[PDB]
């Protein structure tokens with residue numbers, strides 16, 4: 001209850017360029033007993049977004065508690081509300097933002113019945129077939145192909161960041177500042193800057209330079225496929241951050257899951273090429289995986 005931002009000192013050209021994303025206080029209903037889920041990420045609430053023709057839209061609402069002042073609000077708008085006007089069936093897009101005077105800004109996302117892709121496939125109550133799992137990988141590849149075309153570098157591609165709707169359409173999400181805290185199991189922390197680093201998903205060059213590209217998104221996509229075909233097993237479970245790096249430097253890789261098609265494993269191994277320029281583009285991945293999915297019977 002200490003967050004105050006003076007909306008009127010926001011750059012007038014920035015507030016013009018983002019006004020179509022801003023939701024008014026009376027156009028979003030949020031009941032605070034109605035929680036979709038809780039975690040390290042914070043608390044995600046049920047919301048109802050009210051359009052102009054009495055059309056009610058079910059959404060998920062989250063306070064961006066990491067945004068505490070005008071400076072951070074500005075940066076967030078300059079990187080998040082321009083720089084994320086995306087529209088693709090396999091990309092989770094922002095429904096809008098509540099800019100508040102008192103309190104952190106709210107983000108409003110489409111409701112996703114089946115939650116994150118990792119938890120869904122780990123749940124033995126569900127039965128995604130081998131073909132279904134490749135189909136999920138295919139859907140992610142298409143979302144990533146779209147994002148690469150927009151020159152958007154995700155940086156945190158992983159099964160936990162892909163969401164599943166009620167029709168089982170996979171949407172690639174980027175919760176930028178939306179995650180309050182990050183699980184120690186998956187994210188290392190940089191001592192000096194506080195940067196969160198998803199080491200077991202990072203390309204070899206990123207483990208060295210801390211720099212991300214589309215080609216490092218391709219590496220992470222390989223790991224995501226591995227996650228899919230193992231039904232959400234943790235990559236490199238026994239192993240610390242230094243030993244993972246040595247493992248990879250030796251040219252060792254994640255091992256072929258049971259029931260994973262050989263052609264699909266070849267694709268994974270190509271994603272983990274040590275030379276970034278030698279990894280497949282997402283165009284190549286969508287082509288390759290589409291054929292694997294289409295011709296999959298056995």
Ligand SMILES: O=C1NC(=O)[C@@H](c2c[nH]c3ccccc23)[C@@H]1C1=C[n+]2cccc3cccc1c32
Pocket residue numbers: 036037038041044059060061062092109110111112113114115116163173175178179
């Ligand atoms: O984008 C989304 N839409 C939804 O409905 C959220 C959701 C569905 N089941 C859940 C079960 C537990 C928590 C959330 C959900 C999902 C989300 C995940 N995370 C993960 C980290 C931070 C945020 C913030 C907003 C929305 C979501 C979100």
